[model samples]
Target chain A: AKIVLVLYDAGKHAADEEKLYGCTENKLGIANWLKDQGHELITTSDKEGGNSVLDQHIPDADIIITTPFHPAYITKERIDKAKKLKLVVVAGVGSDHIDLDYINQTGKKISVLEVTGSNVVSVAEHVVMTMLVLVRNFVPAHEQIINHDWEVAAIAKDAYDIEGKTIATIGAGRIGYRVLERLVPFNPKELLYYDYQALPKDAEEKVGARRVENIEELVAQADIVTVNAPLHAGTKGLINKELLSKFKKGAWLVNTARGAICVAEDVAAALESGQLRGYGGDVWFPQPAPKDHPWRDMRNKYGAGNAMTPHYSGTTLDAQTRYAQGTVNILESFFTGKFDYRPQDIILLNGEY
Target chain B: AKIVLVLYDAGKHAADEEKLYGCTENKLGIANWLKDQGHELITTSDKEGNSVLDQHIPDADIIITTPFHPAYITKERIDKAKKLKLVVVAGVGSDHIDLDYINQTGKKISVLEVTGSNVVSVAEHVVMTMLVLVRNFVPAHEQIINHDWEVAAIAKDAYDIEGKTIATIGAGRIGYRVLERLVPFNPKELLYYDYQALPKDAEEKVGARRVENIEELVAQADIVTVNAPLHAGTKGLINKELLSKFKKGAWLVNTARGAICVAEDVAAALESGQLRGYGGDVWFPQPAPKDHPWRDMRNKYGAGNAMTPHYSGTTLDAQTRYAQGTVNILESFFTGKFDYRPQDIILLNGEY
Candidate 1:
């Protein structure tokens, strides 16, 4: 048996392996590239269940990789049992699957990292388009044409211009900030951002967005809200029903933030009774969500909802090339004994271990 | 024989009747008002061709009336021998069936006046909505949910905005004036009055809209248009062939007019080869159009075709009453006899 191995999650080509890996799909590109370098790359989602296909090979695996949309849950048990495991990489953002402190304490080498900046634009553009669709009443007015009726009064009654609405994004980083910049042309009454760190004064001048000190005040005043923050202990289930009650009636709440931030049932109830006019977003808690997900059936309420396939946000072919080549550069540095990974991409580090 | 006369195309609702007869739909609702007056009113489209009913009563004894949409063509030859031809009252505009010159020259009595404002906004809006459909881009961005495909290339290659090229038919009063008001908007070019002579000052003020003294100037414009100051010389010939020669992909809009426009062929071509868009106020000519007209078709190209049910510029229920007591207006108009009609409603003077 080979003393070294690399396990790759093959979801990349669907996202951006071609642009990054010079092949249309991620698995083929990564497989061929690692083989050319004299390393074996095993790719599979068969890592799940008690009788897993990957179980026989797991003991010898040295490096493992997976993506957030379809995550590979590497528990502390898997880390401890795989004595040769050296590095675990998440091809996308969020490395929560690997237990952070345990890897450092066990003297079991497991360095976790991800390719950031892959899908910021995808999320931003989708957020704006979805908001415009809901506010403009594009779906219902369009459905009227399908139903063979011409009641402009029925549709246009709730339809409204999107300007003059107070819009805020919870996390104003790469994706959230870009959303604010694009919205400048629409000329909203105010653009509010709530984040832990303050944006530079010059950046504020550029987008004309203001930072709010208290998120409670920000949520209360906002007519439109977006979530862009990452999923974590502090932010998980952040938009629970109790917090939602604080929002104004008929207010639109968009969570492109991970699905966990919002409890699904509360969103459906809010939409049914007019507390919320609509809810929309691209992200969901468990991705490739089951067919009967709450969102699929929530259209029974008047709310116009769309939660769909997660494809390249930052994962555009253009972005895929940048981030994938970026990941390779990080890998090349590690293999050559020069470990200066990108500061932004580094989520966990144990120096001089 | 018992006189059972059915008035074909009696769409003069109370508002229309009120403008012409000084009565509201409630005060003079068709069947009820006709009942109180001891007359029968059957609005029918059965006037066309051979029907058993028409065969039974084609030689009717007393009276008959028809509208532009569903006309009862009573030829002079048929009229010369009918014996009991008493009256033919056109309840709405244009009594083409009863020729005025022949009626007057032969001392026949047929009074023709229209139910006013029924179509003013209806026609005006058709012109506006047709401009929207011609632009070719609304549906391009709309295909997003099914998928995002490179359709911008489709639009950037195919569609041009409606600013530069525009032309109109029969620019008299309303038609010419639609051109006049369209002046400051700065079309790259302008054209007008498909047949007759337009006044010079009217021509100069609208900045050379009277293009090169030819009806084919409509072929040069991006939007070849129509405004109906309709008369005898002008009828069906807004024909499909002349429409084909119109500036390759020019949009055809008709608001001043619906009648003089073709309905079927234009709808077919908007879905077919050229003349990329078509819309107008008149419905080939309106009364009660059939159940499955081309306008209702969505499967066909230009089916959704940016057509409205004809209400364009008029906002007159944006015009009257609170369903509130009419006591305020009745007290003034009836007590003071404010019988003079508003100027906007008057088109021509019939010599008393």
Candidate 2:
């Protein structure tokens, strides 16, 4: 079987052999193990264009592996062109880059899978970090020192304690629950979450969190609202202009989920008008957001409070190792006829989701 | 009585009159209420040179100073102020003044600070700094604004703060609180290096062990946060030799006084990659000079050292607490209350 792997380049740091998760220079990472099995392994960080290595190799490839960091956008067109593609494995979580509906409808359908629960802890930790960075006015404060300027008043004007502020999460699943649990010690006045269903009774009590049925009420009451829901048809553009109006003025929003959940322009406008104190998260609509993306320079009235970063929150070294190993396990199972995949890892199989 | 107050200027934002603790343009903070008792208040942002503050100092009967923008009271100035009987620190930590000079001056002068008012804010800041450095946050976020997307550049340095051994030096109010707060993060080990072992219950609550000495704590921790107060024995404690004892590439955070660690030594360690990162708000001198060594210090890869201004423990919320506490200290003294709260009084009755 011919396997094609798409990943981000580690550049000069790729020399570190231990960081095998950086597949480009690590000899296709675990693809080296596949080579020992007498299978052809192809790896490329160049996964972007029509004439790119990923497109050129996908036609005859039996298995294609891609990471969320540098996704090979497997649209309907790409799926139609790849006549022999049988399995699409996501090295990390979130497989939204691939068109699930298109794949499900295709005659020579493929299986879609991701390493389940691979980076939830990493992402959840990032949500809490972004929230505190906003509330504490950390960026502006650090800037003051870097510029050799010490204006306590300028920085303190926006700085606040997280204690006594109400924080709410839009989802209460694996990542969302972990965020709430970590925030327990900071002592928010209230921990509210809005989900389709209630969390387990013991889990709810553990984080001292309450459930809010009304999404509007949850947004209005929250001093900081973090989006942790999965990205799907229902959640896309969830925090659009109208929904943003319901948020408390000067409230902060954190989304480590998917960038599409928020309308980027509306978020920028809210920040400009002092409607939202700050907005931060790792995910961007297009993986490497164009330089002109609204969030790159969006700021509050004080000309501060933007903590946007590239999608590296869940790709930490520790997380990279876990997901990389999980990818290997999934591939090993696929090579054998057993098809013994973990239930949660399989998103689509045999034309069924 | 002339009460002279020296504080930091909040600039144009000072117009938000409700933040009375912003004493610069707020009429001596709570000292405005002191007018009801027939006392005069002279407030100025000037604390340097033989200028406005020094001019008012010689005539003042009572003085209030804040650590945020300290009016460094030298021994010579103390002798010049013949009428001064009290020095009230509107915030915690009176390391700005010479305690020995105040006690030996023959006249009765009492030094007071708002004890326990700023610990929570400081502890919270310590936690924030730890996460920022461990996650390699500051530089990663900066890259986005710079419109550069480099995932591996950031991921190589970023790691989970959980499951790492953290050792805190100086388990005082702020130190102990840092330990208590860090417990929920599930650190692999919580080791504390303090002169005095915590009470059995307090120690158990934090899941921390008392390391016998500072050297041992530095040697074992993956992250080292200095929460100890700066004093004669502790000043310049984490110098070159001490930093060499640390686990290579371990992150160091000092929200304590900057003078506790030798500035040159820290800058060098960061350059040599012996220290992964150094984050702190406190600096050796108030308003660190433009040429401060730490200002230009960077990590081996030219990222991840967060040395901001000394504003962590002086948050707005902390200001309210300290200001309220300051008011109480002044009132008690005026009422001839000799037995002031022991924690608030550092030097009283001309004795240390």
Candidate 3:
């Protein structure tokens, strides 16, 4: 059997063994083990473009593995080309690349699995860190030292404590719910979330979060909004200009879920117009976010408020360790006769989602 | 009678009305109000010898200072300023003054400050810096600014603060608040090495354990924060000898005072990887020199330090608080009423 894994290039980080679990060079730390088992493994950081490594080898690959950080979007044309493809394993959470429509909308049969609940804590930590980074106006304040300057008021006018702000999260799934729990201690004035269904009465009370039926109601009341919902047809571009106008003026938005969930241009505009105090997250519309991406250079009047970073929040060393072993576990279940699968990990299997 | 305000030079921030409270430019929002009452007011950031502040010290009847960009009030300066009967600190930490000397002089001078002001502000900064270091966020932000996306460069050093042991060297007003804010992060343990243990319930409320000494605390903690007073005992406490005892590659933050940790010693540790990161807003001097080691200290890869000037406790929100408290103190003195909130008074009539 042949397998192809897609991961982000580790760059200088490849030298650190612990950090290589999710990067291309380490091959998820399973290459040698699988190779020893008489199986062939091909791993590449190149996923995009027509003649990319993935496009070259994916046709003969039986298993296609990828991570949400730098996802290989398996489109319908690519999916049909890979006639021998039997399984798609997401090394980290979020199988947004799996052309689910081919399996659901059309009559295609394939198995798709993701390592669910792996990076929840890691990503939630990033979400809270971004919130504080923006509200405290830390980047600019820290920049003062680098430039051999000290201007407290310049940072202070925009800086504020999270204690009195209203925080709202879109989609109260594992990531969003964990963010609420972490934010509870900050003593935000109120916590709100928008989801299709309300949390259990006890769950909502645990974090002192209030669930509003509609997304508009949550954004209107929130001084800071974090997008944590999956990027689907409905949620993609959900934070466009129309929805952004509904946010409290000078609000902060943190979206670690996915970049495309937000219209990048609208977020950039909001940050520019002072409609949003700041915008920060690890995810971008395109993983690398071509240099022209406005978010890379967008700032509020103070030359602050943009906290964008590459999509490595979920692939921290800790999360990578978990998903590394998790991929091994998923692969083992497939190699053997027994078909054991964690219910949560199965996004689609045998023509169903 | 004249009142002189010694504050940080606000620079461009002087334009902001709220920020003017603690800047030399604004006279702490009291210039016009005091002038109407026929009181002379001089506001300046110069505190070194033979400067504007030095020239006015002898004639000034009252003085206002702040911990951030402090005007150090030594006995020599106090003796020169014979008319100085009242000293008001716009913010917390009166370590800048010689309290013992004021008491010994037998000159019944009053020293008061806004207690509990900016405690939350500093506590928030402590946690934010911890995340900034532990997550290796500074470089991550730098990458974006530089138009690069190298995930591994940051993720390799980044770790979660969720399960690490964190200790506060002095668990007092600001230190205890730091513990409260970190409760949700679910750290492995919260350790404190204050002279006295918190009340039984107070310790248990946050699931914090009290260590008997600094040595034990630093040995056990993955991260240590300094919140103790800067005094004879604590000055230069976190030096080479003490830092050597710290867990290898541990992180340290000091918002209490810069002198509490030996500045040069910290950079040495960061250079040798003895300390994973060193961050805080406090420094030994208000305006450290451009070549101050702390200003450019970073481990390999140009990471591991998040040094900001002494402005954490002087946030705009904090300025509103301490500035008003300073005004109230001034009003009481001007009206021949020395009545003050007991907690606000660090010294009353030269008495501790």
Q: Write the per-residue lDDT of candidate 1 for residues A1-353, one digit (tens) a residue.
A: 12122223434324522333322245424565677778776666566775774555567786666555445677777776766666666665666766776776665556676777655654665566556555544455444443454443333334444556789889889978877875664547899999989989998889789999967878888878888888878688788777778888777777776888888878777776666777776565555445455654564244353333232233333444555566676566566667688877776554113
Residue A105 local lDDT, model 2: 71
Candidate achieving higher lDDT, 2 or 3? 3
- Candidate 1 accuracy as TM-score: 0.51
- Model 2 regions more than 4 Å off: A16-20, A80-84, A102-109, A336-338, A349-351, B16-20, B76-85, B105-108, B335-342
- Please give, for residues A252-303, the per-residue lDDT of candidate 3 as tens digits: 9999998889998999899999899899999887767897888999998778
Write candidate 2's Cα lDDT for B31-111 as tens digits. Answer: 548888998888888777668888887878888888877787779879888888888898887767878888877768888
lDDT leaderboard ranking: 3, 2, 1
DockQ (CA atoms), all models: 0.03, 0.57, 0.57
In what order do the candidates fall by TM-score, top score first?
A: 2, 3, 1
TM-scores of chain B, in order: 0.57, 0.94, 0.93
| Tens digits of per-residue lDDT for model 2, A1-353 | 99998887787767643564745876436865897898888888888778899999989999888888888888888888888888999988988789988877764568888999988888988888898889888898888787878777777767777777899999999999989988887778999999989998999999999999988999999999999999878789999999999999999999999989999999999999888999998988765799889899999988887989888899887788878888888888889977899999998985578
What TM-score results for chain B when candidate 1 is compared with the true chain B? Answer: 0.57
The estimated TM-scores of all candidates read: 0.51, 0.93, 0.92
